[PDB]
Design a protein around this motif. Structure first.
Motif, PDB file in Angstrom:
ATOM      1  N   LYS A 278       3.489  12.083 -14.805  1.00 44.36           N
ATOM      2  CA  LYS A 278       3.362  12.835 -13.565  1.00 44.36           C
ATOM      3  C   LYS A 278       2.337  13.976 -13.683  1.00 44.36           C
ATOM      4  CE  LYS A 278       7.896  12.697 -14.090  1.00 44.36           C
ATOM      5  NZ  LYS A 278       9.364  12.489 -13.897  1.00 44.36           N
TER       6      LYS A 278
ATOM      7  N   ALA B 202       8.202   8.228 -13.940  1.00 42.97           N
ATOM      8  CA  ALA B 202       9.128   8.490 -12.841  1.00 42.97           C
ATOM      9  C   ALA B 202       9.104   7.410 -11.744  1.00 42.97           C
ATOM     10  CB  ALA B 202       8.906   9.870 -12.289  1.00 42.97           C
ATOM     11  N   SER B 203       8.191   6.430 -11.847  1.00 45.03           N
ATOM     12  CA  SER B 203       8.076   5.393 -10.824  1.00 45.03           C
ATOM     13  C   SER B 203       7.654   4.059 -11.419  1.00 45.03           C
ATOM     14  CB  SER B 203       7.035   5.784  -9.847  1.00 45.03           C
ATOM     15  OG  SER B 203       5.797   5.834 -10.535  1.00 45.03           O
ATOM     16  N   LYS B 204       7.791   2.962 -10.650  1.00 45.35           N
ATOM     17  CA  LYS B 204       7.398   1.647 -11.131  1.00 45.35           C
ATOM     18  C   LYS B 204       5.904   1.633 -11.408  1.00 45.35           C
ATOM     19  CE  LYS B 204       7.147  -1.370  -6.957  1.00 45.35           C
ATOM     20  NZ  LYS B 204       8.490  -1.345  -6.357  1.00 45.35           N
ATOM     21  N   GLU B 205       5.169   2.434 -10.624  1.00 39.55           N
ATOM     22  CA  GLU B 205       3.735   2.555 -10.808  1.00 39.55           C
ATOM     23  C   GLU B 205       3.418   3.223 -12.151  1.00 39.55           C
ATOM     24  OE1 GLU B 205       0.906   1.803 -10.051  1.00 39.55           O
ATOM     25  OE2 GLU B 205      -0.462   3.524 -10.494  1.00 39.55           O
ATOM     26  N   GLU B 206       4.194   4.244 -12.569  1.00 43.88           N
ATOM     27  CA  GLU B 206       3.920   4.944 -13.825  1.00 43.88           C
ATOM     28  C   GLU B 206       4.242   4.021 -15.003  1.00 43.88           C
ATOM     29  OE1 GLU B 206       5.514   9.123 -13.928  1.00 43.88           O
ATOM     30  OE2 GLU B 206       3.709   9.622 -12.601  1.00 43.88           O
TER      31      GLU B 206
ATOM     32  N   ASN C  74      13.691   9.640 -13.827  1.00 37.64           N
ATOM     33  CA  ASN C  74      13.863   9.891 -12.420  1.00 37.64           C
ATOM     34  C   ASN C  74      15.340   9.616 -12.198  1.00 37.64           C
ATOM     35  OD1 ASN C  74      12.916  10.863  -9.958  1.00 37.64           O
ATOM     36  ND2 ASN C  74      12.314   8.797  -9.216  1.00 37.64           N
TER      37      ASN C  74
ATOM     38  N   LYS D 200      16.052   6.727  -8.114  1.00 42.43           N
ATOM     39  CA  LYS D 200      15.037   5.688  -8.085  1.00 42.43           C
ATOM     40  C   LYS D 200      15.366   4.584  -7.086  1.00 42.43           C
ATOM     41  CE  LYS D 200      17.141   5.388 -11.757  1.00 42.43           C
ATOM     42  NZ  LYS D 200      17.731   6.705 -11.464  1.00 42.43           N
TER      43      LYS D 200
ATOM     44  N   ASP E  15      12.242  -0.298  -7.915  1.00 46.84           N
ATOM     45  CA  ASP E  15      11.824   0.315  -9.157  1.00 46.84           C
ATOM     46  C   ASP E  15      12.784  -0.094 -10.287  1.00 46.84           C
ATOM     47  OD1 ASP E  15      10.008   1.717  -7.309  1.00 46.84           O
ATOM     48  OD2 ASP E  15       9.979   3.448  -8.734  1.00 46.84           O
TER      49      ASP E  15
ATOM     50  N   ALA F  84      -3.223  15.570 -10.172  1.00 47.57           N
ATOM     51  CA  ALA F  84      -2.224  14.528 -10.235  1.00 47.57           C
ATOM     52  C   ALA F  84      -1.860  14.149  -8.828  1.00 47.57           C
ATOM     53  CB  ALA F  84      -1.000  15.026 -10.993  1.00 47.57           C
ATOM     54  N   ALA F  85      -1.661  15.258  -8.083  1.00 54.61           N
ATOM     55  CA  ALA F  85      -1.032  15.273  -6.771  1.00 54.61           C
ATOM     56  C   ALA F  85      -2.068  15.374  -5.680  1.00 54.61           C
ATOM     57  CB  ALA F  85      -0.070  16.441  -6.649  1.00 54.61           C
TER      58      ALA F  85
ATOM     59  N   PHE G  16      17.702   5.550  -0.217  1.00 54.75           N
ATOM     60  CA  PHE G  16      17.964   4.715  -1.387  1.00 54.75           C
ATOM     61  C   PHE G  16      18.901   5.431  -2.357  1.00 54.75           C
ATOM     62  CE2 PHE G  16      14.019   6.956  -2.527  1.00 54.75           C
ATOM     63  CZ  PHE G  16      14.338   7.521  -3.732  1.00 54.75           C
TER      64      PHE G  16
ATOM     65  N   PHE H  70      -1.072  11.129  -4.178  1.00 54.80           N
ATOM     66  CA  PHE H  70      -0.458   9.969  -4.797  1.00 54.80           C
ATOM     67  C   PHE H  70       0.329  10.501  -5.996  1.00 54.80           C
ATOM     68  CE2 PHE H  70       0.245   5.775  -5.889  1.00 54.80           C
ATOM     69  CZ  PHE H  70      -0.602   5.244  -6.852  1.00 54.80           C
ATOM     70  N   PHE H  71       0.888  11.709  -5.835  1.00 53.07           N
ATOM     71  CA  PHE H  71       1.656  12.307  -6.911  1.00 53.07           C
ATOM     72  C   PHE H  71       2.882  11.461  -7.248  1.00 53.07           C
ATOM     73  CE2 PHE H  71       4.972  15.188  -8.573  1.00 53.07           C
ATOM     74  CZ  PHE H  71       4.319  15.576  -9.701  1.00 53.07           C
ATOM     75  N   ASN H  72       3.269  11.470  -8.556  1.00 53.36           N
ATOM     76  CA  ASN H  72       4.330  10.651  -9.129  1.00 53.36           C
ATOM     77  C   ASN H  72       4.069   9.158  -8.899  1.00 53.36           C
ATOM     78  OD1 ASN H  72       7.301  12.683  -9.079  1.00 53.36           O
ATOM     79  ND2 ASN H  72       6.457  11.553 -10.801  1.00 53.36           N
ATOM     80  N   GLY H  73       2.844   8.816  -8.467  1.00 51.45           N
ATOM     81  CA  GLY H  73       2.461   7.454  -8.106  1.00 51.45           C
ATOM     82  C   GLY H  73       3.327   6.793  -7.025  1.00 51.45           C
ATOM     83  N   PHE H  74       3.684   7.532  -5.980  1.00 51.24           N
ATOM     84  CA  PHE H  74       4.388   6.985  -4.835  1.00 51.24           C
ATOM     85  C   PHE H  74       3.482   7.133  -3.613  1.00 51.24           C
ATOM     86  CE2 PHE H  74       8.525   8.466  -7.127  1.00 51.24           C
ATOM     87  CZ  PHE H  74       9.130   7.247  -7.284  1.00 51.24           C
TER      88      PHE H  74
END
Lengths: 440, 440
Positions: free
Chosen positions: A109, A130-134, A154, A157, A161, A417-418, B330, B421-425
């Motif tokens: 992140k 913290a995500s499926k993307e990471e 995370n 989730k 994910d 990042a953000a 979720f 696109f922070f935390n890749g979401f």
């Protein structure tokens, strides 16, 4: 203020090597599955990949010098980052030196730059996704030997994910609420659950107990549910809030984590793992050392067990000091205070991009006039058509003029990042350097 | 509240067509270089390109119905946007009907979605670009016949942007400061300068006179400098601040702009052009109609000249009502107020992405529980590991449960544009629909 600490780096690299008979300088294996020789190689490979130009020596003066040099496809006045990947390595050394018991799992992140992920992989760090993307960005660049080297930190989730971490072979996943247990049980039956607990994070820069961390009370029902949905509770985590200088907090959390370990047994759970999360500062009051001083005793006392492996999730630590942003002053104009004159300037980065930290991180970055002209009531704005894209409002500062540059050091964490791409302005140019000797 | 206004669309499309002998319904050519037949074709082409499913009928109930339908590569619980490109067309019709004198140049910044740029091109709108990137996105998709159809409405632009607009053949560029004149003179000698002036924007949602707009006083020196650096001052612009319901403000600005036109002559400048910028609301107090009522008189009075073409730069108008965001609940957990219970939920979009508007736009979006359960003290969070990624804090709202959806209408402006696109979401899934008949 020091431009580097060569000393630490040297030692870091030596430990576990043939040149000291594979001997560690503490009871603890070097971090990672690589040998000390293998590890120094992997790192030089990365440095070559990214054409890293070594550049050795205060920190400020190191930056001011490097900036004068780097000012002369991208434009000559474009904004850019000087990324010191040497300072990343140095932070990894500084961490081994001070807490060999604790293996750092880097929090993607904070800055998912591929070179930063690659260096940290090669130094034996694990990964906090913290995500499926990471998760996919670490596995798709194969930065681990194993999905055991990823924590999914995370506590909350999405089901898609959970499904994709299960299918990727990921195991170590966080939880802090009953409803979450049920979900893990279902989508991740191969899960090694870690319970996140609340903390007294009121001293931090960014306090996250509001959203995350089971309170002490609720731990019992949570444990109970884990046993119930056939979920394997293999540990306890915590976070004392990002940029927290309060040492009492880290002591306090470990204590709370101990009492949990106790509670866990009664439900059929032998806890292997203690994750002390993040919050450690990355820039040179309270030092990282002062914090380790107060942590090591307590880890010794209650988790000087030996039966339990100890891990962390720093993000800011690693990256914050690594990056310096350079921005060109490309426009200006003067107004009248209500002959008192406001000096307004316009720079090619700002709130919508790198300076979003001013809002999401409560950051207060430092603005350095490259070649310091009298003290004006100055206001500085970013390139976008919005008035709120303002980094300084009506505060004393040297009169500047067009063509000037601003240097902003310590911009490696929770910035790019953000950062977003509003008005279609981004900082793209990247100059890779190293402040530390390694790869001749 | 109406789901559409078929009526307007019909009329819009008819005007200038063979089915009414090429007859306009006001003194003014239809917007654009296309014939009415050519224009209806170009639009149906775009609708086909993006597989737009027509779907005709309150606005809320139209959305609630469409959402139930669209809930059943991307996951089934993923967040997504329903984009009504029909509402874009409708807004263009509504604008011609109310202000045929005024040709709209769409502000890319507000939502640069390629389908939205394409529809607006085909309807005869011009383009308001603020960066070299926005200029390249309009020319590289060839959405204009000419670089005369682009205004560069950034009073403060980097030299590399000035250079690339010059080389692209772009002409119409904004200015509001002396130092800027000099720059335009240099990099853009083919420039048709437009002077931006300050306004009494204190009534807006987003007030930009702080950063942009020459104050009345300074106009004189600015004019003087234009004559001096051989710069051709072909007009006057203004912006009464984004989301401004104050009608007096638009009246006031036109007046101020008139007095400038007067001042301009004395320096050798015949002003062709009057840009009334933006600020017009996009959602159904103060209406867009009420605003036009108070503008048309004044344009008549002082710019009922006939010698001067009149243009605008709306962004929010066009896009705001077009988009609806769907987010899945979720995760959830309950706490104790200090048996009073806080109900915390976790949704798959939030501050770091679509809801950045809460901070950059001062937006207060509406949260709609899809199938409305008692009133709880509720707190809602976005998917990221940050506690500040919170869209609602401890406010009454129905108890929800996992699997539920939230519908957020009117999310077409200053949301995705600026989103990061922070935390890749990110929200990636897009369902294109049309609320208006056009293309059988």
């Amino acid at each position: 203020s020091v431009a580097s600490s060569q000393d630490l780096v040297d030692l870091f690299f030596l430990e576990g090597s043939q040149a000291v008979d594979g001997l560690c300088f503490s009871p603890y294996p070097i971090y990672g599955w690589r040998t000390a020789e293998e590890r120094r190689a992997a790192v030089c490979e990365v440095f070559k990949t990214y054409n890293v130009v070594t550049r050795l020596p205060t920190r400020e003066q190191y930056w001011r010098r490097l900036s004068n040099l780097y000012t002369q496809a991208y434009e000559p006045e474009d904004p850019f980052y000087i990324i010191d990947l040497g300072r990343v390595v140095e932070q990894m050394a500084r961490w081994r030196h001070e807490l060999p018991m604790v293996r750092p799992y880097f929090a993607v992140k904070s800055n998912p730059q591929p070179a930063v992920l690659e260096v940290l992989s090669a130094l034996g760090a694990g990964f906090d996704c913290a995500s499926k993307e990471e998760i996919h960005m670490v596995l798709g660049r194969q930065l681990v030997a194993s999905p055991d080297d990823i924590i999914f930190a995370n506590p909350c989730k999405q089901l898609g994910d959970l499904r994709e971490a299960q299918a990727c072979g990921v195991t170590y996943v966080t939880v802090d609420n009953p409803l979450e247990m049920e979900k893990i049980s279902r989508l991740m039956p191969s899960a090694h659950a870690i319970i996140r607990i609340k903390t007294n994070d009121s001293k931090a820069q960014c306090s996250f107990s509001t959203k995350f961390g089971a309170p002490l009370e609720d731990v019992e029902g949570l444990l109970e549910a884990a046993r119930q949905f056939n979920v394997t509770v293999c540990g306890v985590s915590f976070h004392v809030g990002s940029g927290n200088d309060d040492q009492s907090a880290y002591v306090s959390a470990v204590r709370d984590a101990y009492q949990v370990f106790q509670q866990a047994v009664q439900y059929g759970f032998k806890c292997t793992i203690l994750d002390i999360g993040g919050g450690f500062p990355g820039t040179e009051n309270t030092s990282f050392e002062a914090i380790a001083r107060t942590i090591r005793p307590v880890l010794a006392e209650l988790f000087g067990g030996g039966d339990v492996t100890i891990i962390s999730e720093p993000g800011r630590y690693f990256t914050a000091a690594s990056h310096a942003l350079l921005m060109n002053v490309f426009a200006s104009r003067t107004l009248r205070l209500s002959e008192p004159e406001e000096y307004q300037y316009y720079v090619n980065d700002g709130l919508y991009h790198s300076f979003n930290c001013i809002l999401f991180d409560h950051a207060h970055p430092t603005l350095l006039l490259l070649n310091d002209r009298p003290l004006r009531i100055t206001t500085i704005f970013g390139p976008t058509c919005d008035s709120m894209d303002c980094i300084l409002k009506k505060q004393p500062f040297p009169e500047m003029k067009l063509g000037d540059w601003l240097l902003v050091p310590d911009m490696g964490s929770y910035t790019t990042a953000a950062a977003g791409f509003f008005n279609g302005f981004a900082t793209r140019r990247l100059e890779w350097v190293s402040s530390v000797d390694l790869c001749a």
